[PDB]
Design a protein around this ligand. Structure first.
Ligand SMILES: Cc1ncc(COP(=O)(O)O)c(CNCC(=O)O)c1O
Ligand SMILES: Cc1ncc(COP(=O)(O)O)c(CNCC(=O)O)c1O
Ligand SMILES: Cc1ncc(COP(=O)(O)O)c(CNCC(=O)O)c1O
Ligand SMILES: Cc1ncc(COP(=O)(O)O)c(CNCC(=O)O)c1O
Lengths: 327, 324, 319, 324
């Protein structure tokens, strides 16, 4: 199968599996797993933050993030199109008792400053004390503009709130824009980075932040069930992914460009200008028969096509010709 | 003071105090308060619903309403400008583990496309279970044709419909439709007694037997289980029987207030004044501080009620005329 | 009907109803109700505390109390048989996300050893913030020397101390110690006005300024923010000024009921205030006879007279 | 180090690592990972249940189970000494809004107390929905006759029954009774893989189709929804068919350690020593410091035997003899 459904489907490489073979493990509950400790220390330093926490998913990474910034009743301003609001079953509100404050989100993950400013609650009993603003980079494969970020920071400083980044595909934004992680992450108090997407690690994510923030997140990790034992196997794989699989993301972007240009040339509607990273969003002028046709020819997606490690140049051409055949 | 801040400032009349004086009481926890039992029975009959529940406030009425429709993680669709969403500390979510799903609110109506795009069956999504509307949203009446279409939408997916009817009776007299005609499309209705109707304390959550049985259980948990609430309930009853028709006066006072202020550096639309609210713009802090000194109180918004008279409407008109 | 189910059945006296007729009211949401302000000012001052907050029930008062002490995941240690844990549907846990830590109950006291062992710094545990005590508990009086011990325990571990004084004044009149004395070791106190005191509705939560301010905020979220509650509040103020010393009669009448039945299984040492617990269908016989209670438990109050007490003894001796 | 702190310190064996190297994977969200699918189908079939769910820890397994049985305001009666109540930061209550109802806890919960704990139909109380047992509890085996009596009680009240079987396989090999025999009276069972069995990560929640479906939905909400988890799942599958029978050696070595330690100044009864745990009293802090210096680790004092504890390790006796 040529799988263009998501970049999560990425499988561990032989070099990754060999690193997992020789991965020294310990009990993480006692803080005695050398693999997880090395990953957390590396991740924290890589992003220029104090501490880091290793969790089984990006959902937990975000869930614990919003909960460590917001006590019960406290507010978290985020986009209605953001993964934390719509694709995480509103975990932070249901489980953590936090007040989720959705706000319109643009094609890039930018939330209008006037929308966020009006969402910040005045000190009054009818309202919820807003404490945090959430952002997402990348958002639908789009790169969050850096000058905008610096303005949201000044907005957040004006009200003394906090800033969390859902950076599930942060490194895609890094390699596409030409700005480094340290620069993309500096305006944020905390960031979630997914290892189990483009980077190609089998399981996991990192939550990075200040010593106090992480300490509260770690305590909640135990409560939600994220406290594992010998997770050094998974941690090393993530550590491998973070230092060996970053630069080759340019290929995913390259192949996504090639796929986008090959399909835009055809009864198809897609904006080539929206193709910034490893995602191609397209339309027909419908959908069910297209998917059945493509599945029968060993090709998989769901108007969204996502390139990754397992996808090659010949896969790109095979899918382009399948669309061309569909005519 | 001429108090146009809100209709919640309404004071009990001497006739209402009289009914509160001779109110027969019992222990509501045992279900033995005759004043409470009568209000709830009358409330359920008035709206053509199976059962009703007396509560300390409209916040609790709504708190109990959505929690009784939605269990842990289940979703409720409401307006971003709805009182349940922005003026109730998201209690439904914080205390009740309910997923609040705000959609744009225009008029007070929610676009049918916006509601059904918000309705969700998969692991990433919250299962939607309820839709919330607010009749008399900022003094504006919800159209009955819109209610007719909303019911059919929630019937498709087997969802429930709740009415935040804090000022339902303002809508009833102004639109010229019967109470039952406005509440028929709703499974549950929450009506306030402590606003225009003039009762000192409380609200009524109305719905099915089982729904109210759930709300009643939750009322004890949040701490709304009162004892001899008959004195409050009889007041609410007195209001519901004798203070509904005269709301037509509050509308007229607002109408005379709007037309009287529109004739001046004043920005206000007269098509917004449908009931007892007057929304206004200056073409703000020194404005009300000046009015403070003239014994006139408000906060862009001016609301009429029983304690507001014709001479009070003329005085506030005059004060603005001297101000500009 | 002679109603000995609870002191919650107490009705307003004509004097109280009169004070309600003339009660001055405003909007409590803006803090403009002079009736609720006056009761809050009086209640705070009476117990020697910075502030007070008026709520529609004893359940709300306790709910807000623990939620103001303990945030999500924080612990509150209390008695197994305590009202906050046993009879309030675990609202503070379900709605408030606090960890309730029930400890065995001895007079209604908690063994200091049990409370010490209940205090959690580790990720498997919930960080304790509060201990809860109840006075009176099932009518018995909580010993004053034990209170000072608890405060010393609380000061050692940096915790807070809450009193469920739903029947605090029953303890005050029976023990011979002042309100200030029984309340001084507590950071916060709930007082019910709708029991022995005879007010129709509501309780009062008292504590520090910052505490009440947190409770006032949570009051709005739970739906306890009323409008013209001064009529209810003045009724409570009346009860708190007029109905305290006469509780000694309820105690006396409970004492005389207990002696009339203990002669006829009943422990006379447990009859300390206005409650009588006994043992041996019977309820069906009494209901027809014109007498109501629950079970096991008979509770005297404002509306119960000497003739009532004598009549229920006669109904018991016949059965 | 000789690590007798817990059986959680168990390291993967070379064979287990080899099994993890050639383990086939897929995306678990799409249900396409053959490793976890094989583990879950095998786990469900091993215990005679309909379905199973793979999770990052025993804590999450228990957390989702209580939440899948109990909704908001619903009660679950468990042991005060039980892990779900004592050592899981009351996650079920804090996050899941369920009423934890601890009861005095061989690990059994006295029927009379469980009966007294079940709440009657009233607004003051939380409708009880679940009772939780634990086997093994502190190395002690739950008596099978008592289990059949507990099932009688839960059928009587129409409740669910969950097992925290973190060390269930210790019970099966020590009692002679098979897994299905110990698990049959339970609606849901939670087995750990990262303890005695020696897998690096995870547990299985097993139950009915509908139950596990609900647990799967909640798993996503709490963050247990992994991607390529087949590598962990295969190691769990390996341990489940390769490391069960050898748990007898863990019991044998625990027996020998207890026999050798129960020396003057040491107090312990061997009647409690039934599986892989040894609880022992000195007639404490200075002992830990001394043992650590001699390369022995443990945490009244509990000692736990497991996979990488050898016969000549059970040296610990000599150290105990030298110290006292
Ligand atoms: C922006 C973003 N944030 C958080 C998550 C959550 O990660 P987990 O699935 O590991 O919990 C995802 C997964 N997105 C699913 C997809 O693109 O197919 C995501 O795209
Ligand atoms: C539409 C609406 N719904 C619910 C409530 C809640 O009622 P309580 O205040 O009794 O909780 C209000 C209060 N009205 C506030 C105002 O407009 O001034 C309201 O206006
Ligand atoms: C010690 C104690 N605490 C709190 C409450 C709760 O008060 P409300 O009912 O006003 O919420 C009660 C009432 N329980 C005794 C009875 O009802 O007979 C009580 O006895
Ligand atoms: C009976 C029991 N149940 C559940 C758990 C939780 O498992 P996780 O740690 O995988 O969440 C433990 C671990 N108890 C710690 C110990 O005995 O060392 C346990 O002993």
């Amino acid at each position: 199968y040529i799988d263009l459904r998501s970049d999560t489907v990425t499988q561990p490489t032989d070099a990754m599996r060999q690193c997992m073979l020789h991965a020294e493990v310990g009990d993480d509950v006692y803080g005695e797993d050398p693999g997880v400790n090395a990953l957390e220390a590396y991740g924290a330093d890589l992003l220029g933050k104090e501490a880091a926490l290793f969790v089984p998913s990006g959902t937990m990474s975000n869930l614990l993030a919003v909960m460590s910034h917001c006590q019960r009743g406290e507010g978290a301003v985020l986009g209605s199109a953001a993964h934390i609001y719509r694709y995480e079953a509103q975990g932070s509100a249901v489980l953590g008792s936090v007040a989720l404050q959705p706000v319109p989100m643009q094609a890039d993950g930018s939330l209008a400053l006037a929308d966020v400013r009006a969402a910040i609650a005045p000190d009054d009993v009818h309202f919820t004390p807003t404490r945090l603003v959430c952002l997402e980079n990348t958002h639908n494969g789009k790169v969050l503009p850096l000058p905008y970020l610096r303005e949201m920071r000044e907005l957040v400083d004006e009200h003394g709130l906090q800033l969390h980044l859902d950076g599930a595909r942060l490194f895609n934004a890094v390699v596409a824009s030409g700005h480094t992680v340290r620069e993309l992450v500096a305006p944020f108090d905390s960031v979630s980075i997914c290892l189990s997407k483009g980077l190609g690690a089998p399981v996991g994510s990192l939550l990075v932040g200040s010593h106090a923030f992480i300490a509260r997140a770690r305590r909640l990790r135990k409560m939600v069930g994220g406290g594992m034992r010998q997770a050094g196997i998974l941690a090393q794989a993530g550590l491998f992914a973070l230092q060996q699989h970053v630069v080759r993301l340019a290929d995913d972007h390259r192949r996504a460009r090639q796929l986008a240009e090959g399909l835009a040339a055809l009864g198809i509607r897609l904006d080539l200008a929206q193709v910034q990273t490893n995602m191609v969003f397209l339309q027909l002028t419908e959908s069910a028969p297209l998917l059945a046709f493509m599945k029968a020819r060993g090709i998989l997606f769901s108007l969204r096509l996502v390139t990754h490690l397992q996808i090659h140049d010949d896969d790109i051409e095979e899918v382009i010709d399948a669309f061309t055949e569909y005519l």
